[PDB]
Amino acid sequence: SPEQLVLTLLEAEPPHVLISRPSAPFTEASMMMSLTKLADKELVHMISWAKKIPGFVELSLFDQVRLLESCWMEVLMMGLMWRSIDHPGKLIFAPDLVLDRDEGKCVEGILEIFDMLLATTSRFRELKLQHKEYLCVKAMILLNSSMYPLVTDSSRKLAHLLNAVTDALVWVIAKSGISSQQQSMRLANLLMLLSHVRHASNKGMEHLLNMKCKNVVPVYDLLLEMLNA
Amino acid sequence: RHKILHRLLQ
Ligand SMILES: O=C(N1CCc2cc(O)ccc2C1)C(F)(F)F
Incomplete structure (x- = not known):
């Protein structure tokens, strides 16, 4: 139910993971080390976050697993863009890891990704994305994600949840008081950006799967696991 | 396979 759902999402927000720039100047390696060490740690907290979304843990294990494998980079990115929203030309990875767009030139393949994240973040800024809309959009x-039946009432339980979260977003948007027509346009403007997020996610995933192939960076633990697929 | 994910979900 929308007010309570939104409060839950609010209270579910994972902590900021703190990381710092290395002492020495960035190299392609040490930059990817920093961003993957960050991502790995944020993955740990993404799991706890997901478990706090009402109904998530009532889904079957495979369903929880597969939603997480499917959206994790999207969610890392969505949280990154939200942290960066008020800082044009920068990506606020952590309070002490603030990358200028040009620093993406340090790693082959990464500048484009930064540019996509930066443009999506500018689009959110232009729309004046509100904190409560960001909560619903992240949970959405x-x-x-596509499920297509796996071979293992969970799928019905998923639908009900996504419904509730979409309802919660429509409800958040109704608070602005704008015209019916403009409330529809805002919903569409927000949701159309889900594609950009998925598109950047895909480019992020492939970047990391390629780095992992080049041993351009060793990856560990949770991140390694999620990438192994 | 989701050797550690299973772990943290359960
Ligand atoms: O590694 C990449 N990123 C971009 C998104 C992101 C978001 C986080 O919250 C933490 C780390 C990272 C690292 C990618 F390959 F460029 F996509």
Whole structure:
């Protein structure tokens, strides 16, 4: 139910992971080390976050697993863009890891990704994305992936959840008081951006799967696991 | 396979 759902999402927000720039100047290696060490740690907290979304843990294990494998980079990115929204030309990875767009030139393949994240972040800024809309949109990213039946009432339980979160977003948007027509346009403007997020995610995933092939960076633990696929 | 994910979900 929308007010309570939104409060839950609010209270579910994972902590900021703190990381710092290396002492020495960035190299392609040490930059990817920093961003993957960050991502790995944020993955750990993404799991706890997902478990706090009402109904998530009532889904079958395979369903929880597969939504998470499907959306994790999207969710890392969505949280990154939200942290960066008020800082044009920068990506706020952590309070002490603030990358200028040009620093992406340090790693082959990464500048484009930064540019996509930066443009999506500018689009959110232009729309004046509100904190409560960002909460619903992030939870929608988790809940809105293709499932196509696996071979293992969970899928019905998923639909009900995504419904509730979409309702919660429509309800958040109704608070602005704008015209019916403009409330529709805003919903569409927000949701159309889900594609950009998925598109950047895909480019991020492939970047990391390629780096992992080049041993351009060793990856560990949770991140390694998620990438192994 | 989701050797550690299973772990943290359960
Ligand atoms: O590694 C990449 N990223 C971009 C998104 C992102 C978001 C986080 O919250 C933490 C780390 C990272 C690292 C990618 F390959 F460029 F996509």
